[model samples]
Target: ATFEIVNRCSYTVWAAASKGDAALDAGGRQLNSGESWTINVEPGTKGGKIWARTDCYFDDSGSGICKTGDCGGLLRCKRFGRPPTTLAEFSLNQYGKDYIDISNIKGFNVPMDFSPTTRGCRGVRCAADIVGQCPAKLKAPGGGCNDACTVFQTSEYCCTTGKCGPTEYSRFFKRLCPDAFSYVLDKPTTVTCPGSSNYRVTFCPTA
Candidate 1:
């Protein structure tokens, strides 16, 4: 399968990818608006995720931190990105199918879209203008909404103890993008489409 990262925002973005447990394309560089980067995925591909970083600067040393989605202030990320970053996640060849989801469970710094390029593979996206409408309490100090777990750190907000229902905070995000995940326990938003799991992922695509 192949994965593409496209930039649709007005400014340049330092795209970030995590191990997703695979770590194949776990590093990111930069992409100007309308530019795209594609990564080739192999047969045993499993978990993977993509994100965006903004307001970053680095000298020849590559030691600057992004205002949002900084992965330990490194150009070549060796870990998961920090909170308040929109995430496009995937789990391929799982139980004979694929699962993909756009998540706000980590909170959102930008809008994103994920779609399968292969035949019969459906598309799912969460392109809402969430930053503009983020609630006061959940607002990130930098520039986005903070996840409930990040804000409250309570078992209820984290859904760590059991199968908890959505809170008012999660409901706030779900209202804007019902098709995207609002919490770790969020289930209905996951899209099922294996078909080689070849897909295209975009950052800040038009709403």
Candidate 2:
């Protein structure tokens, strides 16, 4: 048998596992962004099941808990019937998908890319340091304020700061970029932003 930890998030993930009921706990190991580690498992290992956990937090918050035995959590042992020969053969989407948007939020002028056209936002402004700079016009008048925000390469901006806001726009983005991207507030070399402020951006398949 073989066991491996795959990092799917833009951020680094930490993982650790133990065989059988011994509860192998070594504080886990850190997996750099997009990095993976593999371990060989003997068919007759003492542990009938394996307990593994991973999390985005360096300390383990948002960690995923699962076992070769039945347990609760997003990751489960049932997913791994046996050691996998190729990583690509695994159906990752079956576990879950995260979404993110790259726009003025990250202080960047460039927009994130999306596979499905309908899932992307369009006509978003490039300016990073300006309030109401990426404002969107509301379709209706009165009732409440309406404004839109820009998304991808399209000429359409979703409502951002108004009674209507960017609700519809966010929803639309999620549909297309589902489990594809993540928003980063910090300045990491993997991703760069325009300035030094809390910014939002997408970390999709290709950011």
Candidate 3:
């Protein structure tokens, strides 16, 4: 499978991805405004995700931090990014399918779109302007929005158990991005495509 990572925004974005079970490129790199990168993965790939970081300051040694979506302050993340970042998660080649979703479960930092290139799969995206209108309680440092689970640690918001459900806090995000998982129980957002197709990931997909 392949991923066409595109930067549609006017500003720079740092892209990071998990290595997956195939150990295919966990390296994080910079993407200039309007530039693009294509990442190829094998069918055995599993637990892969891609996220964009903003306002990052990395030196020649690759030692620095980002304002949003920092991964333990390391330039190359070997683990998942910190929350409050828009995430596109995937489980490739699981049961012969590719499960994908653009999630707000960690809260939104940038607008993104995840779509299949072919094979009759549907696109799942979240292009809401979430930064400016974030609730005061869920605002991140400097900027960006925080997830309800990040702001409120209640079991209901975190979905610790099967007894949890949606709250107004989660609904607020849901109102903006119905196709994303705004909270733990966020539903109908997962899209399963055949593992043989390529996919597209776009940041700042719209103005």
Candidate 4:
């Protein structure tokens, strides 16, 4: 699969990706506003996710810290970063289709647009002002809005009890971005694109 990561935020962000235990783009890359990076995934890659890190500083060895989405402090992340981050998820070329979605189950740090570049499948975007409108108790130290489950760690919000459903907190995200996976049980949000379609993930998307 071919994927393009674009940054349109006012400031720079560190983009990171994970496909199982493997790291993509050397785990991460610095993207200044208007900059972009492209990545290629094997045909059957699954459980893949990409996210952005903010307020980061790394040395030549790619070791430092980010206020949000720091994956074990390595610029090239070996695994998925910590939560309160926006995610673009993919399961490519599975059963003659590619399944993709924009997920807010972790939370939102930056606006996002995850869509197919080739197939005319539905595009998913979460470009709301989540940080600005976040509930005070769910706000992160930096500039991110935290998911209720991330902040509270309860079974009800985490959906571990099997009886879990949307709560006020999940509703907050769903109301803003109906096309995104807003909570752990949010399933209808997934969009299936034709196999071999190239995809794009844009931060701070305007459209």
TM-scores of all models?
0.92, 0.24, 0.93, 0.96
Model 1 agreement with the true structure over 1-207: per-residue lDDT tens digits: 688989998888888776643344637778888899887756555567788888888668777888888888887666778889888888777777888888898899988889998866677788888888999999988787888898989988898898688889999899999888898788677788864668888888792
What does the lDDT come to for candidate 3?
0.83
Residue 143 local lDDT, model 4: 74
What do the candidate models score in CA lDDT, each in turn? 0.82, 0.27, 0.83, 0.89
Off by over 4 Å in 1: 20-22
* Candidate 3 structure quality by residue, lDDT tens digits, 1-207: 888899998989888887532234645788999999888766767677888888899998888988888877767777777778899988788877888888888888889999999886899888988888888899998568999888878788888876778887788889999999877766768998987778999999885
Better of 1 and 2 by lDDT: 1
Error of 3 at 101 (Å): 0.8
**Candidate 2 per-residue C-alpha lDDT over 1-207 given as tens digits, one digit per residue, 9 for 90 to 100:** 233444444654334334423322332445566665554433333322222232323223423542111122322222321110001111111123212122222111112221112222221111121122322442211111112331242233422222332345443323332321112221211221122112121212232
Misplaced by over 4 Å in model 2 are: 23-27, 46-207
* Clash counts for all predictions: 0, 21, 0, 2
RMSD of each: 1.7, 17.8, 1.7, 1.2
Worst 10 residues of 4 by lDDT: 18-27
Kindly indicate the candidate among 3 and 4 with the higher lDDT: 4
Residue pairs clashing, model 1:
none
User: Looking at candidate 2, what is the lDDT of residue 91?
Assistant: 11
